[PDB]
Write a protein that binds this ligand. Structure first.
Ligand SMILES: Cc1n[nH]c(C)c1-c1cc(Cl)c(Nc2ccsc2C(=O)O)c(Cl)c1
Ligand SMILES: O=C(O)CCC(=O)C(=O)O
Length: 434
C-alpha cells in the first residue's frame, strides 16, 4: 500500500470516515502564554539531564530506546510499558526548584488538555446520537504524562517504515500499553525547528490493526500542535512517530491503569502479608500466626510482587530518579525493609516443613501452596540478575548503571536465606516424591 498526507485530496475524507476518533488541535488554538512555559520547561529538564533512555526487554532481547523519557504525574503512581515500570516525578496536586517548577508547568498543561478532551468527547457523543458524563470524566482524568525527546541527527540509521513507504521512524508501530479501557490520550508535540511525506517535518502515523492494505495517515506536527486519541482509537489502530530533521519534544498524557501500580496499593499488599506475623517487635525471631495453605500462598505471592514489580524495577534504573527528586527514596527503603521481613517469613515457612512433629499430609499441603511462588522467584531472579549483567548494561554511564538490588552473597549472615534458591526448590520437589 501507500500513505496519505494533507497533500492528497482523499486524505481529508479518509480522516472523516475511518479516523473520526482522532482529533487535531493546531498550535493557534493554545495561548502563547502556555507555549512559552511548556517549551521552556522542556529545555529546563533537558539541561538538568532529566530525560533518560530506558533499557527495556522485548522478545527476550535487551534494547536501548532511541527516545529519552521521563515520567511526571500523581505522587506514588507508576506506568508500566515493555516490562519496565516508570515512577512518577510528582507534580503538585493539593495535599530541584527549577525542576519542581517544570512539573507545575506540566500539571497546568494537564488541566488544559483535560478540558479539551472532555469537550471533544462531548462533541463525539452528540454526533453519534443524531451515567455517561461519569465515563467521559474518567476517560479524560489523566494522572501521568510521559515526556519524550529524540535528536534524529544522533542516529546512524533510522528504521524505515515498512508498510506504507512513510520513511524514517523514531518509534515503530504500537499501541499504548497499560491504559484504562477506552481512555483518551493527549499529546503536545514540540518540534524544535512532493512525491509523499516531507521527511524534514515530524509526523504521527496511523493504521488499522492487521491492515496494511488500507492506506495509513501521516499527520504533520508543527511547533505546538496537539493531537488526541479518543475512545477505542488506541486499541483498534496502531500509531508510530515519523522522524524529521530537527529534534523534537513531546508530552503524552495518559490515564494509566494503576490499580496494582500505586505506592498505596503495594503498601497495603505488604500489610496484608504481615498480618500473619507477630508484629510486637522487629527482630529476626519471625513467628507466623497461621500455616494454612492459602494464607501462605498469599504471603509468598506478595513477596514476589514487591521484590520484582517494585524493588528490582526501581533499582534497575540505578538511582537516576535521585537526580530529579528524592520522593521515592524513603518508600523504596520502606518496601525493602518490608521485603526483608518477608524473607524471614519464607525462612519461617521453610523451618516448619522441616519440623519432625508435622504430619506428612500437612507438609504436602504447604508445599503445594508455596512451590509455584518459589519457582517463579528463582526463575525471575535469574532473569533480573542476567539483565543487570549484560554487555549493553555496562556501556551506560555510571549514574544509571543497573543495580541488582537487593543482592547478597552466601557470605552475608544478615540475610536468613541465600539468593540462589535452586537447592531449596529442588529439595521441596524431592520431598513430594517420598
Ligand atoms: C508500548 C508502549 N506504551 N507506551 C509507549 C510510549 C510504548 C512504546 C512503544 C514503542 Cl514501539 C517503543 N519503541 C521502542 C522501544 C525499544 S526499540 C523501539 C523502537 O520503536 O525502535 C517505546 Cl520506547 C515505547
Ligand atoms: O511522541 C509521541 O508523538 C507519542 C507517541 C507514543 O506512543 C509515545 O512515544 O509515547
Amino acid at each position: 500500500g501507500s500513505h496519505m498526507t494533507p497533500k492528497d485530496d482523499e486524505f481529508y475524507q479518509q480522516w472523516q470516515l475511518k479516523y473520526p476518533k482522532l482529533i487535531l488541535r493546531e498550535a493557534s488554538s493554545v495561548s502563547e502564554e502556555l507555549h512559552k512555559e511548556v517549551q521552556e520547561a522542556f529545555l529546563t529538564l533537558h539541561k538538568h539531564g532529566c530525560l533518560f533512555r530506558d533499557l527495556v526487554r522485548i522478545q527476550g532481547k535487551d534494547l536501548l530506546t532511541p527516545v529519552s523519557r521521563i515520567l511526571i504525574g500523581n505522587p506514588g503512581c507508576t506506568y508500566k510499558y515493555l516490562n519496565t515500570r516508570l515512577f512518577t516525578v510528582p507534580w503538585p496536586v493539593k495535599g530541584e526548584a527549577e525542576i519542581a517548577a517544570a512539573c507545575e508547568t506540566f500539571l497546568k498543561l494537564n488541566d488544559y488538555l483535560q478540558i479539551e478532551t472532555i469537550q471533544a468527547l462531548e462533541e463525539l457523543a452528540a454526533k453519534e446520537k443524531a451515567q455517561d458524563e461519569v465515563d467521559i470524566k474518567s476517560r479524560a482524568a489523566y494522572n501521568v504524562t510521559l515526556l519524550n525527546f529524540m535528536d534524529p541527527q544522533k542516529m546512524p540509521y533510522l528504521k524505515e517504515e515498512p508498510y506504507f513507504g512513510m520513511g524514517k521512524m523514531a518509534v515503530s508501530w504500537h499501541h499504548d500499553e497499560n491504559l484504562v479501557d477506552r481512555s483518551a490520550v493527549a499529546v503536545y508535540s514540540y518540534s524544535c525547528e512532493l512525491e509523499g511525506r516531507d521527511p524534514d517535518i515530524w509526523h504521527v502515523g496511523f493504521k488499522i490493526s492487521w491492515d496494511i492494505e488500507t492506506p495509513g495517515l501521516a499527520i504533520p506536527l508543527h511547533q505546538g500542535d496537539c493531537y488526541f486519541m479518543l475512545d477505542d482509537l488506541n486499541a483498534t489502530h496502531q500509531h508510530c512517530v515519523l522522524a524529521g530533521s530537527q529534534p523534537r519534544f513531546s508530552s503524552t498524557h495518559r490515564v494509566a491503569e494503576c490499580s496494582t501500580g500505586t505506592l498505596d496499593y503495594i503498601l497495603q499488599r505488604c500489610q496484608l502479608a504481615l498480618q500473619n506475623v507477630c508484629d510486637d517487635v522487629d527482630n529476626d525471631d519471625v513467628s507466623l500466626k497461621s500455616f494454612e495453605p492459602a494464607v501462605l500462598k498469599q504471603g509468598e505471592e506478595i513477596h514476589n510482587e514487591v521484590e520484582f514489580e517494585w524493588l528490582r524495577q526501581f533499582w534497575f534504573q540505578g538511582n537516576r530518579y535521585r537526580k530529579c527528586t528524592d520522593w521515592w527514596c524513603q518508600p523504596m527503603a520502606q518496601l525493602e525493609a518490608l521485603w526483608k521481613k518477608m524473607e524471614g517469613v519464607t525462612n519461617a515457612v521453610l523451618h516448619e516443613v522441616k519440623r519432625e512433629g508435622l504430619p506428612v499430609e500437612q507438609r504436602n499441603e504447604i508445599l503445594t501452596a508455596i512451590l509455584a511462588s518459589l519457582t517463579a522467584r528463582q526463575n525471575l531472579r535469574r532473569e533480573w540478575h542476567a539483565r543487570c549483567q549484560s554487555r549493553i548494561a555496562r556501556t551506560l554511564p555510571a549514574d544509571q548503571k543497573p543495580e541488582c538490588r537487593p543482592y547478597w552473597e552466601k557470605d552475608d549472615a544478615s540475610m536468613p536465606l541465600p539468593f540462589d534458591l535452586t537447592d531449596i526448590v529442588s529439595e521441596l520437589r524431592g520431598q513430594l516424591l517420598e
